Symmetry: D2
Amino acid sequence: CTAITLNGNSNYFGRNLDLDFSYGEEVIITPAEYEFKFRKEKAIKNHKSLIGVGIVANDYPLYFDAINEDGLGMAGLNFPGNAYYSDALENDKDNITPFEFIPWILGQCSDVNEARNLVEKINLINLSFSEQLPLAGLHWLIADREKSIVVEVTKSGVHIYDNPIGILTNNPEFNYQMYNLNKYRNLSISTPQNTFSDSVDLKVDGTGFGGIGLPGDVSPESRFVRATFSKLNSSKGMTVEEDITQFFHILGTVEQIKGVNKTESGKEEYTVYSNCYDLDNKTLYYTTYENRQIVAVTLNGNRLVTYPFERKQIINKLNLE
Amino acid sequence: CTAITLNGNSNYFGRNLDLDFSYGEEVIITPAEYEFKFRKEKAIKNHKSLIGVGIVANDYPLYFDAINEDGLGMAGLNFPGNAYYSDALENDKDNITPFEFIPWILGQCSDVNEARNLVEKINLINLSFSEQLPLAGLHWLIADREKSIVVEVTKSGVHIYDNPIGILTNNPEFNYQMYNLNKYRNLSISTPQNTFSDSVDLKVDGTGFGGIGLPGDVSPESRFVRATFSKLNSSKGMTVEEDITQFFHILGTVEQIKGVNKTESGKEEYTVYSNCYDLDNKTLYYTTYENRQIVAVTLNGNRLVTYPFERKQIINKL
Amino acid sequence: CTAITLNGNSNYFGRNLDLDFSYGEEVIITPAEYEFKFRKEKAIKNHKSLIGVGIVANDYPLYFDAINEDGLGMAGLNFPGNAYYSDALENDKDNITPFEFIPWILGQCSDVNEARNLVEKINLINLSFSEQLPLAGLHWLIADREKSIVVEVTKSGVHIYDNPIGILTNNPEFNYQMYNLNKYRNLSISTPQNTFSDSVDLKVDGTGFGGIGLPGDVSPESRFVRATFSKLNSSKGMTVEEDITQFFHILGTVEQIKGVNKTESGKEEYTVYSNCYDLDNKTLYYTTYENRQIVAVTLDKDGNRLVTYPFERKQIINKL
Amino acid sequence: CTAITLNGNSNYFGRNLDLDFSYGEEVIITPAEYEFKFRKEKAIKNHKSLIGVGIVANDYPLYFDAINEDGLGMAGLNFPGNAYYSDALENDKDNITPFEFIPWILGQCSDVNEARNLVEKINLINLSFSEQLPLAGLHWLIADREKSIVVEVTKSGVHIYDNPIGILTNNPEFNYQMYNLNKYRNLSISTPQNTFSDSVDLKVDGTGFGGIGLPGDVSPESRFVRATFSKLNSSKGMTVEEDITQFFHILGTVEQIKGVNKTESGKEEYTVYSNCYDLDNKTLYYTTYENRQIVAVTLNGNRLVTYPFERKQIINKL
Ligand SMILES: C[C@H](CCC(=O)NCC(=O)O)[C@H]1CC[C@H]2[C@@H]3[C@H](O)C[C@@H]4C[C@H](O)CC[C@]4(C)[C@H]3C[C@H](O)[C@]12C
Ligand SMILES: C[C@H](CCC(=O)NCC(=O)O)[C@H]1CC[C@H]2[C@@H]3[C@H](O)C[C@@H]4C[C@H](O)CC[C@]4(C)[C@H]3C[C@H](O)[C@]12C
Ligand SMILES: C[C@H](CCC(=O)NCC(=O)O)[C@H]1CC[C@H]2[C@@H]3[C@H](O)C[C@@H]4C[C@H](O)CC[C@]4(C)[C@H]3C[C@H](O)[C@]12C
Ligand SMILES: C[C@H](CCC(=O)NCC(=O)O)[C@H]1CC[C@H]2[C@@H]3[C@H](O)C[C@@H]4C[C@H](O)CC[C@]4(C)[C@H]3C[C@H](O)[C@]12C
């Protein structure tokens, strides 16, 4: 997984979902009056509306990522072995499951400071959705038009990090990912000078020599460094449309193609989908492994509204046969 | 630039064009009876038809890359400083300009063996198209449904290589690009064993550790390595559409986004377009920096036929 | 700085000292009845005798590293910015200065277990030796013939780590150094198989291809990785002499030569000295940048006065 | 193997011998009137005196490396599969065996210019010293106080390269090794500026960050890069003693310790010996894997004078 933010003509938030199969992902709109039920807390019948990507099960929106009507976003990314959910209920804290976490925050919070105050006081409980859909360890990026935070709930407690670069992947923990950037300080967007030695006449026979050292593999640390470099150095766009186009290019630099990353099961990890939310305009844009054409749905009831993903390449054919 | 081939349900050939500006390139179809004129050789009045990408100047198709009706493809890629074009004509050679080279081969040859035979008799001469379009240094990938060759014309002469992997980028020369792969033999698609030492407990907290050491930057040698790793390991598709999708993902692994590669001039190098030719079906598929949605035109008079590129993002709004 | 342990025919502990300048360091033996004075604790008049390397100031042994008569070793290595020394006394603790730490542990402890029990009760306090000799940020490797620990005293408190590989350099903190090893699991001492793709005939035209990916620079994390690789894979010696030989080869893999590492002052950081303590035989072996020949000194252990041997800083060449 | 030159207060040449066993190497002085016999050329009764390292078989000095009385040095380094020795005699060339090569050059030449003239008319012939000492592929560094050349005799003939850096290891061929330096131009001896991005506050918590990217392994290409970086940046000494000390520190950067490099035989490759010749003072300095103490012998007869290497650690016990 890779999640990023971008500040341009509007303000954006999005992710690659990286997995060795598809859940049959869809656009899910949760209107204001869809009743959010909680395993261990009281229902909320009136809340902020959400748009995002996930699956519906038992008429519950299982968000992979989403935004709300105020342009606050939240994404769950794989965090195997580091996530620690409590086996105890707290009498003085909201006892919230991981699958309830996106609704709990995006339903009630208009910005990152409100999200942070609510997250500080949460008890994330170790309770699975169902036998079919068991828990797996996550961590979260939470973003608004101004800034982003990382939430990692581990054995040492609820950690909230200011995220100065608006980047997140998988393991390790965020301080380790941020520390890992320090050894790449020498990378550049332009042909560097010969600091190796002015006693040898080193030749440059192409462009891009300044990036040499940037890791190119799809390990989480490599994707965290490559996404950071690509995002922080990406050219400014003239329009919102150029920004969205640029955002999918940034997610592309860390995309996983089928065949380069074979999991323990022997299945191929790949970028199932990519998305870009325009936070200011509350619009979801997405692509899938199978379809390059961007698809847009805007957030404008007590029932979920769903649009299933097209998993076929939609080609503009100029001529037949 | 990066050019690749792929063998799947059908057989493919295509490239990224990486530059700091667009030339206003378009689809050009050159029909059988468009007359090819050469600066130092007899005109060809009747030839194979071409579909490709480039510009039309003075009613002449300046191809960046193209295929013919037989499914033979040819791409010119930047080769600055190494390309050497002769000021001298040779009476025992075909004297051909670099900009005439795609027409000369694709007009006349049905396959790579025929291409190699014609290249073996060539003398690439130092005459520019015009004062406004001077020669730049190029090398070529020539591919059919079965195999590919690289043509590099340098000070030491006309070099033709068998391309065992179907990959080409820019400098250096092909024997250096191929030799450069050897130090990456240890890379893997899978989590490796701890060979570092049995005496320390090294842990894996994520997938993709096998690839650690693959280069990520957009230098030509890094892109040669990354394209090769991505292409040779890419999963087989079950249909031609799955193959075209997979092809565009492979070119995506070595795409240049605006901002990460700033030239001597201070302009941003970027992937202007990406294309995939289906050689067996004679169909061109392409994308542009500005438009993710693939456009297709199939090769099915004596005048150039053109289809301008649309550089606007075509978004499906539900 | 790089500090290592090695287990062979005997058991060894030692370090590179990497600095911009020599500090006039020399061999210092502290005998059993040299009185150890502490700023905030009772003097120790009878203790284990020490042999190590450091400077003498106002008749006090300021050790860079040392062992005791029981073969317990301790080294202080640079840890700038991360080291945090307390401005206050702490209640149920021994209040010990950083310059007193080596005397405090090696004077009283015979093994790592005892060292750990003592460090658990310690508070390192922000008092300098003198105006001319202010405190620098350090962390410590403590080693015996069996095992080693790391001590890092930071803002979050006194941390003690089991050191499963017997390696320490500088920054970052020990959990970061250890985690950083994980990305190198694929390195090998032998020619690897082509796992890149069996669709391309990759050729091997020399030995050492298994190591490709091992970092070669003298940053502290690169030295941590390269020392770990060299030490864990180093061939076993047949004799104690072969072990000592090997130990100096291992420190050599992460030596800093003059010219490759230029500090902010313009001065080059370099390996001032390398040492190997034979813990079982209580013998200090050392080399200097200037002199390749190993010098040996054995633990002068009775008495009450510091005994010192200055470093030979000339190349001692066998002319036939 | 790694061979280097260094220019300081005097001028130096020397090498690491990297192998998985010892031949019982020794110092060999060949006097002026030891008769050099050649399998296919006229004997040389009077020549320049030699001091070097190697073995003596059948009263013949088999040098691994040596200098002569004029301060001209030559070293043979492993070059497996690339070295090609001729199965033909050439009437217009000197037909010299690989094991005669060092005597042929150092015996007759007073500097690298002269060496180049003689190599331009050599034919290295496929003729072994004996059944027990068969030919292995070599290439050569030839060095004087001013400059150095590399000789690689391959399938495509006798190649001679100016060596602008005074470094040699093993494979690949010299143009490939020099080309491979170009991707390291960004390395530095000082803490670099944050060029990665202004928008993130990257921290430096130690010294040596400028070298990040330098390869640390003992592959021939990694040793070439590392030796080059270490030698071109090494600090000047104010004395000859400080130069010799520095020289052993530079070779130490690319030394092979027992255990990190296992040959196809499963034996450990290690730096058997390191040497430093003072070319101006005609003095050999050497260390062995087993003895850190530097040993000196000066070049000051019909007979080889030889001193075995001590392979015991000579420790100063106070
Ligand atoms: C891509 C990863 C895969 C994680 C995983 O299973 N890793 C195991 C591992 O790597 O060891 C995450 C991101 C969003 C996750 C889903 C969302 O949180 C919504 C929902 C939450 C439920 O608790 C479990 C099912 C699921 C569909 C989740 C399945 C899966 O958890 C997803 C899709
Ligand atoms: C500029 C690019 C190569 C990319 C590049 O230079 N990027 C920077 C880099 O990689 O350093 C090349 C590829 C094909 C070339 C064109 C084709 O060969 C057709 C035609 C050939 C004429 O001789 C000169 C004009 C031109 C339009 C050429 C202009 C230009 O020469 C092109 C479009
Ligand atoms: C000053 C250097 C730190 C290295 C460094 O960063 N210098 C290069 C530079 O400044 O660029 C340290 C390393 C070991 C230190 C000594 C040892 O820790 C022992 C002892 C400890 C006392 O607390 C202070 C005096 C001193 C002699 C210390 C003096 C000095 O504090 C030394 C020698
Ligand atoms: C094999 C080594 C180089 C080290 C090596 O091969 N590396 C191990 C590896 O990388 O596998 C070379 C260097 C000098 C060579 C010798 C000298 O040229 C002198 C002499 C030359 C004779 O033609 C063959 C025997 C020999 C003793 C040679 C044996 C052997 O040919 C030597 C000693």
